[PDB]
Each structure stands twice: as C-alpha cells, then as structure tokens.
Design a protein around this nucleic acid. Structure first.
Ligand code: MG
Ligand code: MG
Ligand code: MG
Ligand code: MG
Ligand code: MG
Ligand code: MG
Ligand code: MG
Ligand code: MG
Ligand code: MG
Lengths: 47, 285, 119, 92
RNA sequence: UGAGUAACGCUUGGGAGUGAGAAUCUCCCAAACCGAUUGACUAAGGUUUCCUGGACCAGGGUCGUCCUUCCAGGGUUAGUCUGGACCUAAGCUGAGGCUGAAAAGCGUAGGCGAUGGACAACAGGUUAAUAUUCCUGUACUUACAGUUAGACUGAUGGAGUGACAAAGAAGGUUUUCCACCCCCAUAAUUGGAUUUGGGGAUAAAUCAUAAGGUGGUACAAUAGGCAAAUCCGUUGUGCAUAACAUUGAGUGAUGAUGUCGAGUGAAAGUAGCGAAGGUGGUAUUAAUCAUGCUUUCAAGAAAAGCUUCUAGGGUUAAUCUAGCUGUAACCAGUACCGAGAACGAACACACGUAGUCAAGGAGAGGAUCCUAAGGUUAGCGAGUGAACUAUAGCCAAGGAACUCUGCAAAUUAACCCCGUAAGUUAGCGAGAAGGGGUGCUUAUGUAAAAGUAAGCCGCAGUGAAGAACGAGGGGGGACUGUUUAACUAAAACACAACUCUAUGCCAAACCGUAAGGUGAUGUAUAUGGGGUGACACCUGCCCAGUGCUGGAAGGU
RNA sequence: AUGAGCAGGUUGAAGGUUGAGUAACAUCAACUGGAGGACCGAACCGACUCUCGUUGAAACGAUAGCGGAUGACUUGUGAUU
C-alpha cells in the first residue's frame, strides 16, 4: 500500500530547512534549543 | 426563450433545458475581443486566511472576466454602436460590445431589445429615451423601465442589473432631491437626482426557467454539495444527533452556528440608508 | 498455505528422463541422484532395445525422446547411437546399463549414483 | 592568476588511453570553486600553450573506508581535462 | 525450556573447468516461466550500490571458491540536452504603511516561485565503466570588434501577435501492409521434395520545390490607444469570385566515393572483409499537416519574447541591416538502480510508485493461447506419495432434500441469421424471451472477403484458452454518484426539483480581537440558511402554550 | 495553479438539407449529423462475496469472481487550510 513517507527532497528542504526555521520566532527558539542540546544534525539541511 | 435537451442517455431521465443561445445571440462561436479580458482567480469559497467561510462554493470552470463599463462616465455626449451580443459567463445577463465613434471599444449590459447596428448614448443632459441610453434620474420621465442604476453619484451601476431586472420611476419626494424608485421585490428607495440610469429592462428574461438537469451540470456551474443539519452529528451542527430522523428539537430552527434563524430581522437599522427608504418589501421603514 | 511452486509435475519427470537419456548416450556416464538414476535406466534400456533394427519407424520412435547436447546435436546423436552404441549391444538380452552408488553428497546427504553402460 | 587553481594531475589508465592520441588531452584537478575561464587562463600563464577546449566534472563525496569503526567521507574534487592542438605535447 | 519442533517467503537436468572442499561459482548445452513484459528509455527518489582485481570474521533464512557484503584501485568530460544566467500562475515574501498588550498578523511597489511559455545538433563510432557531452563528418545559433556596401534609427512606453476549452468527423502526404524483383547462404539418406532460411535503411542542416490550411485586400479622413504617432482601433470607397500577406506536413538534390548492413571470419564470434541496398498497388493500419475544421455549452491562463509605432536621439554621424576576417560562449546535473534484491514498505519482504517504445499468427483489440528482440533460475535441497490441510481435476442414479438463505460451485459464453411480450415519462424494456449455423476440400463467389451449392471426416467442429444464466411478483431509494483507509457501501449522504425565511450593497451570513478577506470584480431572474428530495395527484384542523413579526396608550 | 491519461467495438439523439403535404403550419419519409453524468470490455480506479493467511509473504493481502470505465472521472508536480 501507499505508506506515509513519500520523499521529495525539495519539499523536505523547504519545510524543515534552515531558511525555513530562521524566519519565525518559534523556529529561532527551536534552533536555540538544538544548539543547547548540541545536535550534530542541527537541521535537515545537513545530511 | 428556452430549449429542451432530449438526452436519450438511459441512466435516469432528466428534462433538462437551456437558453437557446442561438436566436438570441450573434455568432454563438466564442471569439471575444482580447483587449478587454482579464482572468478571474477562483477563490473557491475560501478566504485570505485559507479557511472556509462560505460553504459549498468551489469547483467552477475557468472563466475570463470582461471589463464592463458600469460607470459610463469617460464617454459623454458621444455616440456609440452595438456590435455584438456575446455571452459573458460571470453574470446571467448578456453583454454587448459597443464601439464609440472615436474608435474606442467597451462591454456594457444589453437592454432587452437592442440589436446589431443600434445607437446608444451617454450624457448628463436630457436626451432621448430609447433603450441603452444613460442619464441622471431627474430627467427620465416617470414610468419607464430603468436598470443599471447606482446609489452614489459618479459611482457606476450597482443596483438592478440582473437577468431580466428593472425598476420604475415614481415621481419625486417633497425635498426637491431624491427621485423615488420602485425597485424590484416590492421595495421603494429614494435615489439622488444626480444618479445616472439606463433605460430598458435587462435581457435574457428566461433565465428563471432554465432547469439544470443533472447534478454535474450544477457542479460545473460552481455550486458544490450542501448537507442538511439533521444528517449532521450533534457536534458541528445544532440539528445533529437523534437516533434516526429526529426532528428540529430546539424551539426554532437554528443556523450551522448557534444563531436563531427563521424570519428574525437582521438589517442594521442604525444605518445612513434607512431614511432613504419608504418601504422594506413588507411595510413602513 | 497458498502460492506454491509447480513442483515435480509429471511433465517435469518425463522431461528429466529425456534430458538424462540424451546425456548418457552422448557421453556414456552420468553422475546424478540414485533415485533419478533408477528411473532413467528403464527408458535408457527401452530406447537401446528399440534401436537395434534401424528402420525409419525406429528413427521416428526414438526422435520422440532425445534432446541435443553440447557434444552431439539430436540428428547427430541419432547417427551416433545407431552406428556404434546400438549394434554393440545387439546380442545382449537386457542388462544394457549399470547404476552404482557413490558417496553421500555434502550439500544434502543425497545418495549420489553413477549411471553408465558397458558390455 | 595565483595559479593556486592547478592543485594536481591525476595519472590513470583512462588518461593514458586518451592522451596517446593526437589531441593530447591532459588532465588536472582544480579548485572546487574555480571555473573554466580561470582554468584556461591559468594554463596559459603556467605553461605557455593557449588551450583549445576545457572540460570539467566533479566527483561528489561518498562514504570512504566503509565499515572500519571510524567511517569517513571522501573528497570533493573538480577534474578538468585540457585539450591541445594536434601537433603539441608538454609534460608536468 | 518450547526444540534441534514450526518456518526457510513461486522454478530444472547434465558435461567440462576451478578449488583442499561444490547441487549452490565460471563456461557450454538444453529445459521452464515472462513477452502491454520479469523486455528497452527516462523522470521522482536513493546516494557509489557502477567497472576491474582480491577476501570469505560478520550480513545472505542452507552452502559458497560467490554476492547488490567487505578491502585496494578506478569512472561520470556539453555554446545546442535537464535547470540557472529570460518569463510569469496559484502562491510566498514584503520597503514605506495599516491593525494589534507583546511576539506577530494583513498588505502596496518590488522580488521570488515550474508542474507551464520562449531559446541553436544530427548520424555513426570508441572504453571494463561515460556519452546528442569524447572522436570522426557535416551544421546552426548569440554576443564582440575590424572591414565592404545599403539604410536615419526608432524605447524603460502604446498596439498586434504570443494566447490556448471538451467532443466528433473528414481529407492531403509519407508510412505500416500486400505483390513483384535484385542479393546472400542453402540442395538436405528417416519415406518423400524440383527448395528452405534471412536481409533489402541511410539524419539534422543548406538550396529549389511544395498538395493543402488560415484571413478580405488597397487608398483617404481621423475627436480614442495617460504625451506621441505614418502602428492599432474606428468610419467611408473600389476590386471582388483571386490578388496580397502568412503558414505549411511532404518531394527532389547536397550531406553520402562517407557510416551502416545479412553473413564471413584471423589472432574471442571480437578485429578486419563486407553483395543487394529496389520497383508498383494500397477498398487496411498508426503519425504528421493541426495551436487546422465543425458543433456544443459548463464559454475555455499571465507575462517575457517576436513584429511594429512614434517620442527620444542622431548629420558633421549614431544605430541597424546583408556579407568577409578574427575572438568567446559561464554555473550545477550527466555513473548505476528505476524494483518478486538498490525507491517508499523495520529485510535480499508476494504490496505500492508519473510518463515513453510496445514485434508475429487467429482476433474488433494493448483481451485471450503460443512465440520473437531481449531477459530470469524467484538463494535451502533430496525422497516417500500415510492420515490431515490448501489448490486443481473428476464423480454414476437423483438434482436444492443440506442450508440461516441456491453462500460457494455449476450451466450459458465470441461472430453470423431468424424472432422477441407485459408495462411506460414513449427514450427504454432488450444482448429480452426463445432458436438455428460455425470444421476441411472443390467450384461459384466481388476488388479482398463474408455468403452460396456440392462433397468429406469425427463422438463432438468460436473442437483448446478468453468472453451474459434466465423468468415472475413484492419492500426501499427516483436514477449516475459519495461514504465508516484497516470488520458496516446500505434502505444512510448527495442530487435534479419544491417551498419557507434573511438580505437594497460599506448587503445579510462568515474567519479574524481588529486591520484585512470571502460573499463578489456579484446586485433580489442575485446570495446565505432551515426543511423536504426526479415525475404525477394531493398537502385537512388548532395561533391556548413555545418561537417569530408588528403594536401603541398604560403597568413594573 | 498547471500538465498528462482513458486499447477496442456499438447504439445512432437534437439540429440541418431534400421530397410529399399544408391556403401557410403541424406531421411524415429519405439522406446527412454524431449527442449522451449512454452501452459491452482491457490498462486505470474502487473494494461486493467465498476460500486461504490470521506469531501471516503482508501492522489489511493472494488466486478466482466483482461495480465504474468521456465523467459529479483518474493521476503526477507545486502551493495552501
Ligand atoms: Mg513437539
Ligand atoms: Mg511435526
Ligand atoms: Mg517442516
Ligand atoms: Mg512489485
Ligand atoms: Mg508506472
Ligand atoms: Mg499481442
Ligand atoms: Mg496477455
Ligand atoms: Mg430526506
Ligand atoms: Mg421520503
């Protein structure tokens, strides 16, 4: 059957990307938290 | 007039009808002028926020709006000529292509009766009364079918411009302004004597009797399905619930929201236009 | 259970018999499973016995069985049979072949057997 | 014209196969940001032969060393092949 | 422990070789499925999985010398291809600005945003791996100067074009196809043959030729096209019946003394060799002309770009047009997979995923049975042929008695010819019901064929496969549709139509706190809401209570 | 918003041209024309029934049947609530 994750990299980048998250207050806050927890994969822009 | 559509497609029977569109129009083949066409973006009942605000509206076809000179103000005391009576999809009436003698084209509403080669005019002074003309209401004698009226001066034709609509003159008020108008649907307003008007009823008198025959035909015309409140669940409608065809339990019928509905007066009577009214389809003020 | 392999249908058995008899006439030795060897032997014997007379009817009847191999093609294998293999055995009543048992296989512990034919 | 855009040549069987012809297609690896115009001008001012045609490809990075407790990533490089007129040939 | 139990997730036989060891690896020969596909090309994705050499801790439902695994080395080559450097749609963002305790929200100019528009390259070869990219041969384009000749250019702006629906049909031209003919190998021990098998093409571009398609054409006035106008628009006059403008599949010649080619074939069927490389018919087929035409109503994208227009400029020459010489053509993608093993399914999982090419026989066909081009061995086997289970096949006599019910299963089944009721919105019912014929040969058949008469075989002749079971009465809903993904597809929902009510335009209803927006670039023959639900006939009584509307003096 | 797709085969509407007829209509016959939430049926979509599987091949499927299949259709890509 047709599962729940059909991938299309343009959509993924535009939706969870770095320029997507660095344009609203909540996105800036989540980048703050992720720098705080020190994620190596900060957003989905890096593989 | 109207013309039947004998289907002989053996899935149900539909005595569908359609306006003849042949004996009424000129050159039914659709070749509208390019200079006066702008595409319409179909909002589809939606909103700038993207939610739904007007229900069951969507799925209409692609149209092309014809820029109509409802104002009739840039060309005054200058003759014109009706060139074609095309079918513009947006409004129920018939639009006509006129060409002012200097060579300038426009789309107007076709008063019922004018034909190819006729002459129409627009002015500010007393002129003739033949259909298609335009002039301030103070000059049109009482009794003539008048359409494409407008409320504010130099504001272009809002009131009474639908398929087969009109309005009659009924003299003047006691002030010396405010020519009275007997509108369609029993009301009677007071229009300012500086308001323009166009004589002659609007064409396509038989749009009341065209019968959409199949649900589809209606879906393509822009009206999507409407669901009765008694089919709803008790949530998202006041009429929901009930274990099988229960009636409208609350004391009066209700809207999809919680508003009392049936016959409850709604006009905002604290408005400037209440004193420009003689009657409101039933009685005084 | 449902979808299942076609398996050892009767056509599979008979076609295996044909391929193995072709192979044994072509070379003269087969290293197969024992319980296919005992089943190939019967058809082998019947062919060699039917092939000692050499009229065209026998050629037709043997054409119904043989298949071409890398060594000989079918119309070469027929000549190779009727020229040297069949007449060699012309005086032996039965007993045209032997099946001797080899050692068990490492893959399946099946009883490998060798099929051959000598005077 | 820093000529920092000629990092290295690569010597492979393919390069020799293409080089022993008549066109004498040399090959180099260049700065990942460099462009064909800069490459051919650099070649002009490093050797002295105005090149005919320049071609560039880039080998995107992949996984390297596979499974070795410290898997790594390869190197992004732009290989530019450089063509030369029929009767000329130079060395590195 | 259960237990060395269930499971091991669609398929074979052998020869030769390797290797310590082989069902499992390499080669060969068959064999068995696929063939509107398990074949070929690519988009999306994935991210080295691709090629060569080596290894066999682990992963592979067994094994393994082997793997899409691991290790070392390697491969992706563009002025013209997909996209940027050009264009815009939905929409997104959004200077100033509007609104909002705060963050933010809305939104104008501008800017982004392909799934679309515009833009110039074809054929063949080559490597283990790339190819309109490299190479060979022949081309075109867009800029740049310098030069020869002609000409006054004519935009950030105006106009035209671009610029468009769905369905249907009929024509033109090449083709498919049919026939003939040149060429090649073949000449046959199983009775007989005096044949049998295969192939028969060459591109963009340049020049001439183009059947046919579209749409009047010239001249004069001009008050409009934010100014300007020789352009467009408008109004007059003549020719008209074809001139003019514009477009145009195909044809021929160059390209081509080239490449390719059935086959042959040395040191692997590879290198090299490489004959014909054609004529007619065409009542059949697809493709192009075609953004063509006709009809209908649900009335069928924008901008850039191209042509033009004047303004603006230019003459002591700028700018453009045509040619010659020379120079330049940037940035990312380009491997491989594209799924019964590389994508999404936790996997080497029976599932899913856009588009393109799509052979032959019978046939209406992309159905159905078998095959071709090509491609795979469904990564546990070997036996035995007990109960028992699934799946197929078959079952005398009876033929629905089992049963909750004829659930399931069975009969009919394509084509051709007769014939076909009750009822009705007069369309249907109806493929109604009910029946018959079907194969091969000869002759007749028309232009091919169906058909026709005679004859012949079999138990049976769409001999196989793939094709409706039917009649009669009743309830519900009018119908076609939608629905509870993953137990309910229904008598529910929808619907056409009816009525009632609200609403006079800054409409009413609605989202939002407000701005703003829909309703609507709509205007009572219109829009929102409640209720019924095609079509026909009917829709009785009660206004005390609740609700709704109005009331004008009083009471609180 | 924008694009693509629906092998093949039938029924043969409205309208129109002609002839009769009509005082002229109406009506009838032939020919053309090629409509339809039409018909039969593959790809495509959906999911009515049995059987199987139900620690499955599969966190909802297979064989065999089944309804629609030019339309209120199906589908990809992008945006949005
Ligand atoms: Mg036990
Ligand atoms: Mg047991
Ligand atoms: Mg077992
Ligand atoms: Mg699959
Ligand atoms: Mg597909
Ligand atoms: Mg076929
Ligand atoms: Mg098939
Ligand atoms: Mg109801
Ligand atoms: Mg009812």
């Amino acid at each position: 059957m047709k599962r729940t994750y059909q991938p299309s990299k343009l959509k993924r980048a535009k939706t969870h990307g770095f320029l997507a998250r660095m344009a609203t207050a909540s996105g800036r806050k989540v980048l703050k938290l992720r720098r705080k927890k020190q994620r190596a994969q900060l957003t989905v822009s890096s593989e | 007039p109207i013309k039947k559509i004998i289907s002989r497609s053996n899935s149900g029977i539909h005595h569908s009808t359609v306006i003849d569109y042949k004996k009424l129009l000129t050159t039914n083949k659709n070749k509208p002028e390019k200079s006066l066409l702008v595409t319409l973006k179909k909002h589809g009942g939606r909103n700038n926020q993207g939610k739904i605000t007007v229900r069951h509206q969507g799925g209409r076809n692609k149209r092309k709006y014809r820029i109509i000179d409802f104002k009739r103000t840039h060309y005054d005391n200058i003759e014109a000529t009706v060139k074609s009576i095309e079918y513009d999809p947006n409004r129920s009436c018939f639009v006509s292509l006129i060409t002012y003698a200097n060579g300038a084209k426009s789309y107007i509403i076709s008063p019922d009766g004018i034909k190819v080669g006729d002459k129409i005019l627009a002015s500010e002074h007393p002129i003739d009364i033949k259909p298609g003309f335009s002039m301030p209401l103070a000059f049109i004698p009482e009794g003539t079918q008048v359409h494409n009226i407008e409320l504010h001066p130099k504001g272009g034709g809002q009131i009474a411009r639908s398929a087969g609509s009109y309005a009659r003159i009924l003299g003047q008020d006691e002030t010396g302004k405010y020519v009275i108008l007997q509108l369609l649907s029993g009301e009677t307003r007071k229009f300012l004597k500086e308001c323009r008007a166009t004589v002659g009823v609007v064409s396509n008198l038989d749009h009341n009797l065209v019968v959409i025959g199949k649900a589809g035909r209606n879906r393509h015309r822009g009206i999507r399905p409407t669901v009765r409140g008694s089919a709803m669940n008790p949530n998202d409608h006041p009429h929901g619930g009930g274990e099988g065809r229960s009636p409208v339990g609350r004391d009066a019928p209700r809207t999809p929201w919680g508003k009392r509905h049936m016959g409850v007066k709604t006009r905002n009577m604290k408005k400037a236009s209440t004193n420009l009214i003689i009657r409101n389809r039933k009685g005084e003020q | 259970s449902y979808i299942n392999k076609p398996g050892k249908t009767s056509a599979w058995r008979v076609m295996t018999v044909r391929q193995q008899v072709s192979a044994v006439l072509a070379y003269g030795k087969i290293e197969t499973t024992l319980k296919k060897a005992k089943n190939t032997q019967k058809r082998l014997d019947k062919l060699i016995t039917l092939a000692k007379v050499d009229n065209f009817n026998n050629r037709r009847q043997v054409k119904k069985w043989l298949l071409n191999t890398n060594l000989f093609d079918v119309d070469q294998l027929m000549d190779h049979l009727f020229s040297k293999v069949a007449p060699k055995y012309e005086k032996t009543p039965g007993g045209y072949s032997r099946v001797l048992k080899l050692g068990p296989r490492r893959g399946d512990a099946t009883e490998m057997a060798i099929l051959q034919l000598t005077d | 014209d820093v000529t920092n855009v000629l990092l290295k040549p690569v010597l492979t069987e393919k390069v020799y196969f293409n080089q022993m012809g008549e066109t004498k297609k040399y090959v180099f690896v260049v700065n990942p940001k460099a462009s064909k115009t800069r490459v051919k001008l650099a070649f002009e001012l490093v050797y002295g032969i105005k090149p005919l045609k320049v071609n560039t490809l880039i080998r995107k990075p992949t996984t390297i060393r596979g499974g070795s407790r410290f898997p790594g990533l390869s190197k992004l490089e732009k290989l530019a092949v450089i063509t030369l007129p029929k009767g000329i040939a130079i060395s590195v």
